Amino acid sequence: HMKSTFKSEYPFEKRKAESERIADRFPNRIPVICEKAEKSDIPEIDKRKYLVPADLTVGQFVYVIRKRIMLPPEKAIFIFVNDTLPPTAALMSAIYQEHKDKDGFLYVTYSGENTFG
Amino acid sequence: GPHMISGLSVIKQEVERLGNDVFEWEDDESDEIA
């Protein structure tokens, strides 16, 4: 199966164009994209689109992920950005400011495994 | 991914579900994503 969904629907230029407006819509927001690693064994999300605020932290985002897949408390889920595991106080705001891309939108990834690769 | 070829002119894109205001569901802002 594919990998990207909400970001696969359209090309990049589409996203960049989106963030170009989201900047005039919600400046006090943090556009990100939750994704599930392939190696992972957990259930992949339905779509990759998460508009977290500039207040929500990293340890606060996961929760949102644990909501979609409604993963039980008997499972685990770790975030990964560029193959790096950010802290909890790593305000998603300061995260999307260091993990931003040409498109502007963030690209996070969660996996039941806290491994690298 | 998809890219342009040659010449200059409008562009055409596809879609599966989204497309409308790059959002067509509960609510992107929905706390569901935060």
mmCIF file of all heavy atoms in Angstrom, chain A residues 5-6 9-11 14 18 21 25 29 46-47 49-53 56 63-64 68, chain B residues 2-4 13-19 21-23 25 28-34:
data_model
loop_
_atom_site.group_PDB
_atom_site.id
_atom_site.type_symbol
_atom_site.label_atom_id
_atom_site.label_comp_id
_atom_site.label_asym_id
_atom_site.label_seq_id
_atom_site.Cartn_x
_atom_site.Cartn_y
_atom_site.Cartn_z
ATOM 1 N N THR A 5 -1.213 10.015 2.406
ATOM 2 C CA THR A 5 -2.625 10.055 2.070
ATOM 3 C C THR A 5 -3.085 11.500 1.866
ATOM 4 O O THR A 5 -3.197 11.965 0.732
ATOM 5 C CB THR A 5 -3.394 9.323 3.171
ATOM 6 O OG1 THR A 5 -2.674 9.632 4.362
ATOM 7 C CG2 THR A 5 -3.282 7.802 3.053
ATOM 8 N N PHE A 6 -3.336 12.170 2.981
ATOM 9 C CA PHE A 6 -3.781 13.553 2.938
ATOM 10 C C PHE A 6 -2.752 14.439 2.234
ATOM 11 O O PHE A 6 -3.089 15.508 1.728
ATOM 12 C CB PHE A 6 -3.930 14.020 4.388
ATOM 13 C CG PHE A 6 -4.210 15.516 4.535
ATOM 14 C CD1 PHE A 6 -5.463 15.948 4.840
ATOM 15 C CD2 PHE A 6 -3.205 16.416 4.358
ATOM 16 C CE1 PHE A 6 -5.722 17.337 4.975
ATOM 17 C CE2 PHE A 6 -3.465 17.806 4.494
ATOM 18 C CZ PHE A 6 -4.717 18.236 4.800
ATOM 19 N N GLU A 9 -2.790 13.033 -1.746
ATOM 20 C CA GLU A 9 -3.895 13.485 -2.574
ATOM 21 C C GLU A 9 -3.405 14.506 -3.603
ATOM 22 O O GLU A 9 -3.700 14.387 -4.792
ATOM 23 C CB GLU A 9 -5.020 14.068 -1.716
ATOM 24 C CG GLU A 9 -6.232 14.432 -2.575
ATOM 25 C CD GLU A 9 -7.486 14.599 -1.713
ATOM 26 O OE1 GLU A 9 -7.450 13.990 -0.576
ATOM 27 O OE2 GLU A 9 -8.437 15.279 -2.125
ATOM 28 N N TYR A 10 -2.665 15.488 -3.108
ATOM 29 C CA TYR A 10 -2.132 16.529 -3.970
ATOM 30 C C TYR A 10 -0.606 16.596 -3.868
ATOM 31 O O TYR A 10 -0.010 15.975 -2.990
ATOM 32 C CB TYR A 10 -2.721 17.846 -3.458
ATOM 33 C CG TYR A 10 -3.092 17.823 -1.973
ATOM 34 C CD1 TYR A 10 -2.234 18.373 -1.040
ATOM 35 C CD2 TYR A 10 -4.282 17.258 -1.566
ATOM 36 C CE1 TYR A 10 -2.582 18.354 0.357
ATOM 37 C CE2 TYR A 10 -4.630 17.239 -0.169
ATOM 38 C CZ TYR A 10 -3.763 17.787 0.723
ATOM 39 O OH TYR A 10 -4.093 17.769 2.043
ATOM 40 N N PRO A 11 -0.001 17.374 -4.805
ATOM 41 C CA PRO A 11 1.444 17.530 -4.831
ATOM 42 C C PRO A 11 1.914 18.456 -3.707
ATOM 43 O O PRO A 11 1.105 18.951 -2.925
ATOM 44 C CB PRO A 11 1.758 18.070 -6.216
ATOM 45 C CG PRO A 11 0.451 18.635 -6.749
ATOM 46 C CD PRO A 11 -0.673 18.125 -5.862
ATOM 47 N N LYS A 14 0.995 22.089 -3.638
ATOM 48 C CA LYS A 14 -0.356 22.223 -3.118
ATOM 49 C C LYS A 14 -0.291 22.552 -1.624
ATOM 50 O O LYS A 14 -0.985 23.451 -1.153
ATOM 51 C CB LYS A 14 -1.179 20.974 -3.436
ATOM 52 C CG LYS A 14 -2.674 21.244 -3.258
ATOM 53 C CD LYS A 14 -3.421 21.092 -4.585
ATOM 54 C CE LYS A 14 -3.091 22.245 -5.535
ATOM 55 N NZ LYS A 14 -1.743 22.065 -6.120
ATOM 56 N N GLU A 18 -1.077 25.734 0.605
ATOM 57 C CA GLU A 18 -2.015 25.628 1.709
ATOM 58 C C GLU A 18 -1.497 26.402 2.923
ATOM 59 O O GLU A 18 -2.226 27.198 3.514
ATOM 60 C CB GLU A 18 -2.279 24.164 2.066
ATOM 61 C CG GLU A 18 -3.124 24.051 3.337
ATOM 62 C CD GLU A 18 -4.570 24.474 3.073
ATOM 63 O OE1 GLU A 18 -4.860 25.074 2.027
ATOM 64 O OE2 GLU A 18 -5.409 24.157 4.000
ATOM 65 N N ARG A 21 -1.821 30.020 3.051
ATOM 66 C CA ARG A 21 -3.102 30.580 3.445
ATOM 67 C C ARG A 21 -3.341 30.363 4.941
ATOM 68 O O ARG A 21 -3.907 31.221 5.615
ATOM 69 C CB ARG A 21 -4.248 29.943 2.655
ATOM 70 C CG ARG A 21 -3.878 29.787 1.180
ATOM 71 C CD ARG A 21 -4.851 28.848 0.465
ATOM 72 N NE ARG A 21 -6.242 29.315 0.662
ATOM 73 C CZ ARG A 21 -7.325 28.511 0.607
ATOM 74 N NH1 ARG A 21 -7.187 27.190 0.360
ATOM 75 N NH2 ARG A 21 -8.521 29.036 0.797
ATOM 76 N N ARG A 25 -4.787 32.462 8.097
ATOM 77 C CA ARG A 25 -5.964 31.930 8.762
ATOM 78 C C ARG A 25 -5.679 31.705 10.248
ATOM 79 O O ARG A 25 -6.351 32.278 11.106
ATOM 80 C CB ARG A 25 -6.405 30.608 8.129
ATOM 81 C CG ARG A 25 -7.621 30.813 7.221
ATOM 82 C CD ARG A 25 -7.698 29.718 6.155
ATOM 83 N NE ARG A 25 -8.148 28.448 6.767
ATOM 84 C CZ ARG A 25 -7.852 27.225 6.275
ATOM 85 N NH1 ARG A 25 -7.105 27.099 5.158
ATOM 86 N NH2 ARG A 25 -8.307 26.156 6.902
ATOM 87 N N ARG A 29 -1.023 28.764 15.097
ATOM 88 C CA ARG A 29 -1.251 27.337 14.953
ATOM 89 C C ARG A 29 0.042 26.633 14.532
ATOM 90 O O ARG A 29 1.021 27.287 14.175
ATOM 91 C CB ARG A 29 -2.339 27.055 13.915
ATOM 92 C CG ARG A 29 -3.728 27.095 14.552
ATOM 93 C CD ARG A 29 -3.892 25.974 15.582
ATOM 94 N NE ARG A 29 -5.250 25.394 15.487
ATOM 95 C CZ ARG A 29 -6.385 26.078 15.746
ATOM 96 N NH1 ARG A 29 -6.333 27.375 16.120
ATOM 97 N NH2 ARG A 29 -7.545 25.460 15.630
ATOM 98 N N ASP A 46 -5.602 6.870 9.516
ATOM 99 C CA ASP A 46 -6.505 6.963 8.382
ATOM 100 C C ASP A 46 -5.954 7.980 7.380
ATOM 101 O O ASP A 46 -6.004 7.756 6.171
ATOM 102 C CB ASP A 46 -7.892 7.434 8.819
ATOM 103 C CG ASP A 46 -8.769 6.354 9.459
ATOM 104 O OD1 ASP A 46 -8.285 5.513 10.229
ATOM 105 O OD2 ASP A 46 -10.017 6.401 9.131
ATOM 106 N N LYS A 47 -5.443 9.077 7.920
ATOM 107 C CA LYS A 47 -4.885 10.130 7.088
ATOM 108 C C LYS A 47 -3.833 10.902 7.887
ATOM 109 O O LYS A 47 -3.832 10.864 9.117
ATOM 110 C CB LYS A 47 -5.997 11.014 6.522
ATOM 111 C CG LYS A 47 -6.075 12.345 7.272
ATOM 112 C CD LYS A 47 -6.263 12.120 8.774
ATOM 113 C CE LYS A 47 -7.696 12.444 9.200
ATOM 114 N NZ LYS A 47 -7.758 12.695 10.658
ATOM 115 N N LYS A 49 -2.826 14.353 8.788
ATOM 116 C CA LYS A 49 -3.196 15.757 8.857
ATOM 117 C C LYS A 49 -3.511 16.125 10.309
ATOM 118 O O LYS A 49 -4.559 15.752 10.834
ATOM 119 C CB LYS A 49 -4.337 16.060 7.885
ATOM 120 C CG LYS A 49 -4.922 17.451 8.141
ATOM 121 C CD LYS A 49 -3.880 18.540 7.879
ATOM 122 C CE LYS A 49 -3.828 19.539 9.037
ATOM 123 N NZ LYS A 49 -3.150 20.785 8.616
ATOM 124 N N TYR A 50 -2.585 16.853 10.917
ATOM 125 C CA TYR A 50 -2.751 17.275 12.297
ATOM 126 C C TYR A 50 -2.374 18.748 12.468
ATOM 127 O O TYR A 50 -1.224 19.127 12.254
ATOM 128 C CB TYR A 50 -1.788 16.416 13.120
ATOM 129 C CG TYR A 50 -2.330 15.024 13.457
ATOM 130 C CD1 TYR A 50 -2.539 14.103 12.452
ATOM 131 C CD2 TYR A 50 -2.611 14.693 14.767
ATOM 132 C CE1 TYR A 50 -3.048 12.794 12.770
ATOM 133 C CE2 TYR A 50 -3.120 13.384 15.085
ATOM 134 C CZ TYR A 50 -3.314 12.500 14.071
ATOM 135 O OH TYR A 50 -3.795 11.263 14.372
ATOM 136 N N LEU A 51 -3.367 19.539 12.853
ATOM 137 C CA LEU A 51 -3.153 20.961 13.056
ATOM 138 C C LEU A 51 -3.089 21.254 14.557
ATOM 139 O O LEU A 51 -4.057 21.740 15.139
ATOM 140 C CB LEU A 51 -4.218 21.773 12.315
ATOM 141 C CG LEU A 51 -3.736 23.066 11.655
ATOM 142 C CD1 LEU A 51 -4.403 23.267 10.292
ATOM 143 C CD2 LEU A 51 -3.948 24.267 12.579
ATOM 144 N N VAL A 52 -1.939 20.944 15.138
ATOM 145 C CA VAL A 52 -1.737 21.169 16.560
ATOM 146 C C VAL A 52 -1.462 22.654 16.803
ATOM 147 O O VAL A 52 -0.919 23.338 15.937
ATOM 148 C CB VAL A 52 -0.619 20.261 17.078
ATOM 149 C CG1 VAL A 52 -1.073 18.800 17.117
ATOM 150 C CG2 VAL A 52 0.650 20.420 16.238
ATOM 151 N N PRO A 53 -1.860 23.121 18.018
ATOM 152 C CA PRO A 53 -1.661 24.512 18.386
ATOM 153 C C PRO A 53 -0.195 24.787 18.722
ATOM 154 O O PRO A 53 0.640 23.888 18.651
ATOM 155 C CB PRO A 53 -2.595 24.744 19.563
ATOM 156 C CG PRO A 53 -2.932 23.363 20.105
ATOM 157 C CD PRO A 53 -2.506 22.337 19.067
ATOM 158 N N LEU A 56 0.310 23.063 22.503
ATOM 159 C CA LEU A 56 0.403 21.623 22.671
ATOM 160 C C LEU A 56 1.867 21.192 22.549
ATOM 161 O O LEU A 56 2.580 21.651 21.657
ATOM 162 C CB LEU A 56 -0.531 20.907 21.695
ATOM 163 C CG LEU A 56 -0.931 19.479 22.071
ATOM 164 C CD1 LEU A 56 -2.318 19.450 22.717
ATOM 165 C CD2 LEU A 56 -0.842 18.547 20.860
ATOM 166 N N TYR A 63 -0.904 11.758 22.423
ATOM 167 C CA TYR A 63 -2.256 11.491 22.885
ATOM 168 C C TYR A 63 -3.251 11.526 21.722
ATOM 169 O O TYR A 63 -4.120 10.662 21.618
ATOM 170 C CB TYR A 63 -2.597 12.616 23.864
ATOM 171 C CG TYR A 63 -4.076 13.005 23.877
ATOM 172 C CD1 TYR A 63 -5.041 12.040 24.090
ATOM 173 C CD2 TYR A 63 -4.448 14.318 23.676
ATOM 174 C CE1 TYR A 63 -6.433 12.405 24.102
ATOM 175 C CE2 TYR A 63 -5.841 14.683 23.688
ATOM 176 C CZ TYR A 63 -6.765 13.708 23.901
ATOM 177 O OH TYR A 63 -8.080 14.052 23.912
ATOM 178 N N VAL A 64 -3.089 12.533 20.876
ATOM 179 C CA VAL A 64 -3.961 12.691 19.725
ATOM 180 C C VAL A 64 -3.816 11.473 18.811
ATOM 181 O O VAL A 64 -4.792 11.022 18.213
ATOM 182 C CB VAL A 64 -3.656 14.011 19.016
ATOM 183 C CG1 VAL A 64 -4.593 14.223 17.825
ATOM 184 C CG2 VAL A 64 -3.732 15.189 19.989
ATOM 185 N N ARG A 68 -6.690 8.435 17.594
ATOM 186 C CA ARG A 68 -7.072 7.947 16.280
ATOM 187 C C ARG A 68 -7.098 6.417 16.271
ATOM 188 O O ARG A 68 -8.156 5.812 16.101
ATOM 189 C CB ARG A 68 -6.103 8.440 15.205
ATOM 190 C CG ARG A 68 -6.576 9.767 14.607
ATOM 191 C CD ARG A 68 -7.684 9.541 13.575
ATOM 192 N NE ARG A 68 -8.984 9.364 14.258
ATOM 193 C CZ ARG A 68 -9.797 10.380 14.613
ATOM 194 N NH1 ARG A 68 -9.449 11.658 14.351
ATOM 195 N NH2 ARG A 68 -10.938 10.107 15.219
ATOM 196 N N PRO B 2 4.331 14.120 -8.905
ATOM 197 C CA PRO B 2 3.944 14.780 -10.138
ATOM 198 C C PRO B 2 4.669 16.119 -10.295
ATOM 199 O O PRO B 2 4.811 16.868 -9.331
ATOM 200 C CB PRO B 2 2.435 14.931 -10.047
ATOM 201 C CG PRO B 2 2.087 14.773 -8.576
ATOM 202 C CD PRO B 2 3.303 14.193 -7.870
ATOM 203 N N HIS B 3 5.108 16.377 -11.518
ATOM 204 C CA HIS B 3 5.815 17.613 -11.814
ATOM 205 C C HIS B 3 5.396 18.125 -13.193
ATOM 206 O O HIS B 3 4.761 17.406 -13.960
ATOM 207 C CB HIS B 3 7.328 17.416 -11.689
ATOM 208 C CG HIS B 3 7.984 16.885 -12.941
ATOM 209 N ND1 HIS B 3 7.323 16.075 -13.848
ATOM 210 C CD2 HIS B 3 9.245 17.058 -13.428
ATOM 211 C CE1 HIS B 3 8.159 15.779 -14.833
ATOM 212 N NE2 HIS B 3 9.350 16.389 -14.570
ATOM 213 N N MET B 4 5.769 19.368 -13.464
ATOM 214 C CA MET B 4 5.440 19.986 -14.737
ATOM 215 C C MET B 4 6.380 19.501 -15.842
ATOM 216 O O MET B 4 7.406 18.885 -15.561
ATOM 217 C CB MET B 4 5.545 21.508 -14.608
ATOM 218 C CG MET B 4 4.181 22.128 -14.301
ATOM 219 S SD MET B 4 3.037 21.774 -15.625
ATOM 220 C CE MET B 4 3.394 23.139 -16.717
ATOM 221 N N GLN B 13 -4.768 19.269 -11.252
ATOM 222 C CA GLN B 13 -4.480 18.377 -10.141
ATOM 223 C C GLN B 13 -5.654 17.422 -9.909
ATOM 224 O O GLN B 13 -6.760 17.664 -10.389
ATOM 225 C CB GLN B 13 -4.157 19.167 -8.872
ATOM 226 C CG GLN B 13 -3.144 20.277 -9.161
ATOM 227 C CD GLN B 13 -3.805 21.443 -9.899
ATOM 228 O OE1 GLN B 13 -5.016 21.548 -9.990
ATOM 229 N NE2 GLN B 13 -2.943 22.312 -10.421
ATOM 230 N N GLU B 14 -5.372 16.357 -9.173
ATOM 231 C CA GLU B 14 -6.390 15.366 -8.870
ATOM 232 C C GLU B 14 -6.803 15.460 -7.401
ATOM 233 O O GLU B 14 -6.397 16.382 -6.696
ATOM 234 C CB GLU B 14 -5.901 13.957 -9.214
ATOM 235 C CG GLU B 14 -4.619 13.620 -8.451
ATOM 236 C CD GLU B 14 -4.265 12.139 -8.599
ATOM 237 O OE1 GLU B 14 -4.756 11.304 -7.825
ATOM 238 O OE2 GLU B 14 -3.450 11.866 -9.561
ATOM 239 N N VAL B 15 -7.605 14.492 -6.982
ATOM 240 C CA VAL B 15 -8.078 14.456 -5.608
ATOM 241 C C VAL B 15 -8.830 13.144 -5.368
ATOM 242 O O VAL B 15 -9.385 12.563 -6.299
ATOM 243 C CB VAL B 15 -8.926 15.693 -5.312
ATOM 244 C CG1 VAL B 15 -8.065 16.826 -4.750
ATOM 245 C CG2 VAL B 15 -9.685 16.150 -6.561
ATOM 246 N N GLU B 16 -8.825 12.717 -4.113
ATOM 247 C CA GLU B 16 -9.500 11.487 -3.739
ATOM 248 C C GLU B 16 -10.702 11.791 -2.844
ATOM 249 O O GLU B 16 -11.775 11.217 -3.024
ATOM 250 C CB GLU B 16 -8.535 10.520 -3.050
ATOM 251 C CG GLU B 16 -7.734 11.231 -1.956
ATOM 252 C CD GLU B 16 -6.816 10.250 -1.223
ATOM 253 O OE1 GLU B 16 -7.302 9.360 -0.511
ATOM 254 O OE2 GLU B 16 -5.554 10.437 -1.416
ATOM 255 N N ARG B 17 -10.483 12.694 -1.899
ATOM 256 C CA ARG B 17 -11.536 13.082 -0.977
ATOM 257 C C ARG B 17 -11.433 14.573 -0.650
ATOM 258 O O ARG B 17 -12.435 15.285 -0.656
ATOM 259 C CB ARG B 17 -11.455 12.276 0.322
ATOM 260 C CG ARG B 17 -10.024 11.806 0.587
ATOM 261 C CD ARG B 17 -9.825 11.458 2.064
ATOM 262 N NE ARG B 17 -8.412 11.099 2.314
ATOM 263 C CZ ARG B 17 -7.988 10.403 3.390
ATOM 264 N NH1 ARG B 17 -8.866 9.983 4.325
ATOM 265 N NH2 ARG B 17 -6.700 10.138 3.512
ATOM 266 N N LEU B 18 -10.209 15.002 -0.371
ATOM 267 C CA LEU B 18 -9.963 16.395 -0.042
ATOM 268 C C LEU B 18 -10.013 17.233 -1.321
ATOM 269 O O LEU B 18 -10.377 16.730 -2.383
ATOM 270 C CB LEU B 18 -8.651 16.537 0.735
ATOM 271 C CG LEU B 18 -8.666 16.021 2.175
ATOM 272 C CD1 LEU B 18 -8.621 14.491 2.210
ATOM 273 C CD2 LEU B 18 -7.534 16.645 2.993
ATOM 274 N N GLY B 19 -9.643 18.497 -1.177
ATOM 275 C CA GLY B 19 -9.642 19.410 -2.307
ATOM 276 C C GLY B 19 -10.378 20.707 -1.965
ATOM 277 O O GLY B 19 -9.915 21.795 -2.304
ATOM 278 N N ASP B 21 -11.102 23.519 0.097
ATOM 279 C CA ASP B 21 -10.465 24.259 1.173
ATOM 280 C C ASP B 21 -9.453 23.356 1.878
ATOM 281 O O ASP B 21 -9.228 23.489 3.079
ATOM 282 C CB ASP B 21 -11.494 24.716 2.210
ATOM 283 C CG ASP B 21 -11.591 26.231 2.400
ATOM 284 O OD1 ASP B 21 -10.594 26.956 2.270
ATOM 285 O OD2 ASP B 21 -12.768 26.669 2.698
ATOM 286 N N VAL B 22 -8.869 22.455 1.101
ATOM 287 C CA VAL B 22 -7.885 21.530 1.635
ATOM 288 C C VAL B 22 -8.403 20.944 2.951
ATOM 289 O O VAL B 22 -7.622 20.662 3.859
ATOM 290 C CB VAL B 22 -6.533 22.232 1.785
ATOM 291 C CG1 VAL B 22 -5.413 21.219 2.026
ATOM 292 C CG2 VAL B 22 -6.231 23.105 0.565
ATOM 293 N N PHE B 23 -9.717 20.781 3.012
ATOM 294 C CA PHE B 23 -10.349 20.235 4.200
ATOM 295 C C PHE B 23 -11.836 19.970 3.957
ATOM 296 O O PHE B 23 -12.553 20.838 3.462
ATOM 297 C CB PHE B 23 -10.202 21.283 5.305
ATOM 298 C CG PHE B 23 -8.875 21.207 6.062
ATOM 299 C CD1 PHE B 23 -8.033 22.275 6.067
ATOM 300 C CD2 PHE B 23 -8.536 20.073 6.731
ATOM 301 C CE1 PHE B 23 -6.802 22.206 6.770
ATOM 302 C CE2 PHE B 23 -7.304 20.002 7.433
ATOM 303 C CZ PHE B 23 -6.463 21.070 7.437
ATOM 304 N N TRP B 25 -14.053 17.578 6.383
ATOM 305 C CA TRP B 25 -14.377 16.596 7.405
ATOM 306 C C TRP B 25 -14.726 17.352 8.690
ATOM 307 O O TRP B 25 -14.944 18.562 8.664
ATOM 308 C CB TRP B 25 -13.234 15.599 7.591
ATOM 309 C CG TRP B 25 -11.918 16.237 8.042
ATOM 310 C CD1 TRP B 25 -11.741 17.222 8.933
ATOM 311 C CD2 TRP B 25 -10.593 15.891 7.585
ATOM 312 N NE1 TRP B 25 -10.405 17.536 9.082
ATOM 313 C CE2 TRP B 25 -9.685 16.701 8.236
ATOM 314 C CE3 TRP B 25 -10.177 14.926 6.650
ATOM 315 C CZ2 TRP B 25 -8.304 16.628 8.025
ATOM 316 C CZ3 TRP B 25 -8.792 14.866 6.450
ATOM 317 C CH2 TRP B 25 -7.865 15.674 7.099
ATOM 318 N N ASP B 28 -10.466 20.542 10.666
ATOM 319 C CA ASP B 28 -9.019 20.506 10.794
ATOM 320 C C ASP B 28 -8.619 21.052 12.166
ATOM 321 O O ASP B 28 -7.723 20.515 12.815
ATOM 322 C CB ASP B 28 -8.351 21.374 9.727
ATOM 323 C CG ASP B 28 -8.395 22.879 9.996
ATOM 324 O OD1 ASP B 28 -9.536 23.330 10.392
ATOM 325 O OD2 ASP B 28 -7.389 23.587 9.833
ATOM 326 N N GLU B 29 -9.302 22.114 12.567
ATOM 327 C CA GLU B 29 -9.030 22.739 13.850
ATOM 328 C C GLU B 29 -9.492 21.831 14.992
ATOM 329 O O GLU B 29 -8.974 21.916 16.105
ATOM 330 C CB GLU B 29 -9.692 24.115 13.942
ATOM 331 C CG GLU B 29 -11.139 24.061 13.449
ATOM 332 C CD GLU B 29 -11.959 25.216 14.026
ATOM 333 O OE1 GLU B 29 -11.436 26.010 14.823
ATOM 334 O OE2 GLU B 29 -13.181 25.275 13.619
ATOM 335 N N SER B 30 -10.458 20.982 14.675
ATOM 336 C CA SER B 30 -10.995 20.059 15.662
ATOM 337 C C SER B 30 -9.887 19.613 16.619
ATOM 338 O O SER B 30 -8.784 19.283 16.185
ATOM 339 C CB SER B 30 -11.634 18.844 14.988
ATOM 340 O OG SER B 30 -12.323 18.015 15.921
ATOM 341 N N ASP B 31 -10.221 19.615 17.900
ATOM 342 C CA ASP B 31 -9.268 19.214 18.922
ATOM 343 C C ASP B 31 -8.875 17.753 18.701
ATOM 344 O O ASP B 31 -7.911 17.269 19.295
ATOM 345 C CB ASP B 31 -9.877 19.335 20.321
ATOM 346 C CG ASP B 31 -11.340 18.900 20.428
ATOM 347 O OD1 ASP B 31 -11.530 17.623 20.454
ATOM 348 O OD2 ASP B 31 -12.253 19.738 20.484
ATOM 349 N N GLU B 32 -9.640 17.089 17.846
ATOM 350 C CA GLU B 32 -9.384 15.694 17.540
ATOM 351 C C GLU B 32 -7.940 15.510 17.067
ATOM 352 O O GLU B 32 -7.388 14.414 17.154
ATOM 353 C CB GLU B 32 -10.372 15.171 16.496
ATOM 354 C CG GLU B 32 -9.919 15.530 15.081
ATOM 355 C CD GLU B 32 -10.906 15.005 14.038
ATOM 356 O OE1 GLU B 32 -11.271 13.820 14.071
ATOM 357 O OE2 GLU B 32 -11.298 15.875 13.170
ATOM 358 N N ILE B 33 -7.369 16.600 16.576
ATOM 359 C CA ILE B 33 -6.001 16.572 16.088
ATOM 360 C C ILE B 33 -5.109 17.373 17.041
ATOM 361 O O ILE B 33 -4.120 17.967 16.618
ATOM 362 C CB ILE B 33 -5.939 17.056 14.638
ATOM 363 C CG1 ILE B 33 -6.750 18.340 14.452
ATOM 364 C CG2 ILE B 33 -6.380 15.954 13.674
ATOM 365 C CD1 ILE B 33 -6.303 19.419 15.441
ATOM 366 N N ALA B 34 -5.491 17.358 18.310
ATOM 367 C CA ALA B 34 -4.739 18.074 19.326
ATOM 368 C C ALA B 34 -5.415 17.880 20.686
ATOM 369 O O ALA B 34 -6.492 18.422 20.929
ATOM 370 C CB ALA B 34 -4.627 19.549 18.935
#
